[PDB]
Amino acid sequence: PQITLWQRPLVTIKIGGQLKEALLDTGADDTVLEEMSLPGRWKPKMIGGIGGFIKVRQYDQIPIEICGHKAIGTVLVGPTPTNVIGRNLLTQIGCTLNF
Amino acid sequence: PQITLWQRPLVTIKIGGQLKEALLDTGADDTVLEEMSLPGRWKPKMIGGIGGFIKVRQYDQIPIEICGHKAIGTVLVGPTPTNVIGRNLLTQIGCTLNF
Numbered sequence A, B: 001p002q003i004t005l006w007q008r009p010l011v012t013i014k015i016g017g018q019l020k021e022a023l024l025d026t027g028a029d030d031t032v033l034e035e036m037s038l039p040g041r042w043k044p045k046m047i048g049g050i051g052g053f054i055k056v057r058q059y060d061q062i063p064i065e066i067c068g069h070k071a072i073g074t075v076l077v078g079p080t081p082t083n084v085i086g087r088n089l090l091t092q093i094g095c096t097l098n099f
């Protein structure tokens, strides 16, 4: 699909069998979601945003559907103001910027 | 043009007679740049992202040029870790997300 930016590019994603709303963010290297449960072991990661740094839990090879498109990748879980889908997953679904 | 997301979507912008590198961010409500001088009146604003909030100065009706495309809009100036071009300007240059 072609998404304009007059409104926030919020889309429905499916992870762990649950539906959630997330923001397609081209300015994000990684994908970070609000607190949730995920299987397996996690690794620590410190990420930086406009307001500073936060600690997150890193889960790899996690299946996640974005707007119906299937992806399997790294998902970070932590105190984020909103669920954000970063380039690591936007690339998996073939997303690009055009103007 | 079509910008891939394998790498950070960085572009050159012309603003206030200066050339700066900025990140095209579909997940950003506003456009925020590192400390710089801009003409006209302004008002304080607090913006939030990952890590918390930072205080910036809000300048409205500021001429800007991105990848050759001219536009005008609000530009926030403050201690941002990186220059971000938000939706308020991305819309003006006809930028869309496609997949």
Ligand SMILES: CNC(=O)[C@@H](NC(=O)[C@@](O)(CCCN(Cc1ccc(-c2ccsc2)cc1)NC(=O)[C@@H](NC(=O)OC)C(C)(C)C)Cc1ccccc1)C(C)(C)C
Pocket: A023, A025, A027, A028, A029, A030, A031, A032, A047, A048, A049, A050, A052, A081, A082, A084, A086, B023, B025, B027, B028, B029, B030, B031, B032, B047, B048, B049, B050, B081, B082, B084, B086
């Ligand atoms: C309502 N707030 C906003 O729209 C704000 N948006 C954001 O912060 C984001 O759009 C992300 C902005 C892009 N930043 C750029 C950046 C790059 C390097 C550093 C940096 C470099 C060294 S120290 C800090 C700091 C910021 N990107 C990010 O924040 C992401 N970080 C990242 O890719 O880092 C490598 C991540 C944390 C989401 C993964 C995420 C977001 C969207 C909606 C609601 C809440 C949050 C605002 C435009 C005001 C700044």
